[PDB]
Structures are given as C-alpha cells and as structure tokens.
Amino acid sequence: VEIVATILSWTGLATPTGVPKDEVLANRLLNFLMKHVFHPKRAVFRHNLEIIKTLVECWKDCLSIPYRLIFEKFSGKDPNSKDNSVGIQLLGIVMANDLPPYDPQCGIQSSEYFQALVNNM
C-alpha cells in the first residue's frame, strides 16, 4: 500500500509506461492487487478498491486490464453469499473511467460473460 501510493503519487513525472519490464511488473502488480482485494474488513476493502482505481486511472497506458478474474468473481452461482460483490465492484471500478469491458478478445465468450453478469443481477 505504502510503496504503491508512493510511486503512484509520482505521476506526471516517471510514468510506468514506455519501458517493457516496467510495464510487465505494473501488469503483474495490477493482476495481483485485484486477485487479493477481498478482506473480511470492509474499510480496508474499500481502501484496496481505491488503490486499484488510482492505479488504473493513473497508469492507463499499459492497459492490460485483467478480465477472467473479475469474471469468475461475479460468475459465482448459489446466491447465498456476497461472493460476487467483488467482481461487480471491480467491474464498476474499471467502468468508472472510459475503459471498455471488451470480453472475448482475451478471455471467455461475451455471450456467457454478460450472461453471468446478468444472472447475478
């Protein structure tokens, strides 16, 4: 949290883009940060979501938005647990800017991606 807040604060100067390995590390950071973003504690949960949204609206140029885990995060069935909240709220984060949720060009077919989105609707 502290080191990423520090590097993100250094925006306008030292963007993480234009360098290959810097971009790859940024992408692993993003995928890892969405991968573990669910904490039994709601305040730090909101905080982590804010970290992710700051990361994605500050980098924005090594695009690489990881689908297929937001997808499997809302794709859960048996609606008796708030397990799908993470995927829909991550999707809301990525939508909160101009990012397009173009599904089936890297992951699972839109006809079932959006299907599970609606089923949890």
**Cβ atoms of residues 59 and 26 within 8 Å:** yes
**Cβ atoms of residues 30 and 56 within 8 Å:** yes
Alpha carbon distance 27, 12 (integer Å)? 19
* Experimental method, per PDB record: cryo-EM
Resolution in angstrom units: 3.3
